[PDB]
Amino acid sequence: SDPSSINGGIVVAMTGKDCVAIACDLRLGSQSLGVSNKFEKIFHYGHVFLGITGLATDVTTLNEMFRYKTNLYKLKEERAIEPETFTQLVSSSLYERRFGPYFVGPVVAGINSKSGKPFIAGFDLIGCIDEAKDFIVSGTASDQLFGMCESLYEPNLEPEDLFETISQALLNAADRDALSGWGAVVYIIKKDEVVKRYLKMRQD
Template sequence: MFVTARPFSLLPHLPGGTPPDADAEAEADHPPLTDGGAAVAMVGKDCVAIACDLRLGLQALTVSNNFPKIFQYGDVFLGLTGLATDVATVSDLFRFKVNMYRLREERNIAPATFANLVSSSLYEKRFGPYFVSPVVAGLEPKTGKPFICGFDSIGCIDFAKDFIVSGTASEQLFGMCESLWEPDLGPEDLFETISQALLNAVDRDALSGWGAHVYIIEKDKVTKRLLKGRQD
């Protein structure tokens, strides 16, 4: 019979006191939980939106309020939350792989194809994974149908028909998106919805926020907007 024990502290427990919180200790050593960040993608009517916060920090220390987490690869957008160094590494890795795909195939990569590329690339590193939680958004080139999906750190794909979230503000984002999202939103309504969801969610998470970037992806154009958020 196997028994799973909870992690414990090597520090002695004080008589009559409460033992140290092992869960809090584990969270303190987990890079995605210490670096913070938030990303969300939403589906609209013939359009799709993806947004991220701009904070770069280490727990309570804020290093920068201009650290974008969304990267464009042709017609596909990738949002990355997690360890900042892995965000930079993974974004450059996919820049290389997408450029090689374009040279071989002589066409831009489709969102569904890019999602499988992300999944297989992350799974290759499953024994020493990147500390990132990617989100992919785009429009299918042939049908114009919105496409969004998310991943865990080893590449398991989570397809979605409404919205997908990642980062330390995930729980808050889920609540806001469930409250505000509606089917068949137009580009302007979709922008308002994703902006309100993200700004209100990061206000309730100490590790993310400090402004946001929002991309509205339509068939013939991409609109990028900068949102000013609380700086505290």
């Protein structure tokens, strides 16, 4: 009944030293029934990454919408959109459906190509920006993620250390949520290289 917890899933993003990380589980379900273990929730438009939790139809719809908008942005601006700018575009786009909203919990992650500054941001379903330096969490196990991130996180982690921290935050949070899991992906993002790692986890 609650649209934000029909399909399940989680996203988490973290900042490190000259890097950002964003991660998600791979589950899509119909309440108790597991449907897909390959439903990735992180997308990217150029060097800006967007994770989206919530109702899966809206996740797909919003990805297509932001691909649409970032492609036109690029054609007109003659440059790739930056994380700060994209964050405002997501906020704008969500609030325009104020009284008929997309049931989602988006998370932006990326590095500004000009300043080199790591950036993350989160949103509620109607566009309120959460602009936190450390970490952003979203999904049906957001409580679990807040707990994991608050205790595991420390600032200025190197890329390969940040990978371990965010991976353990996701994994152990997902294992305390019925509607999250069935696989996981972690993106480690640096100014001009991005590595994508699929994690091994329990499949129940």
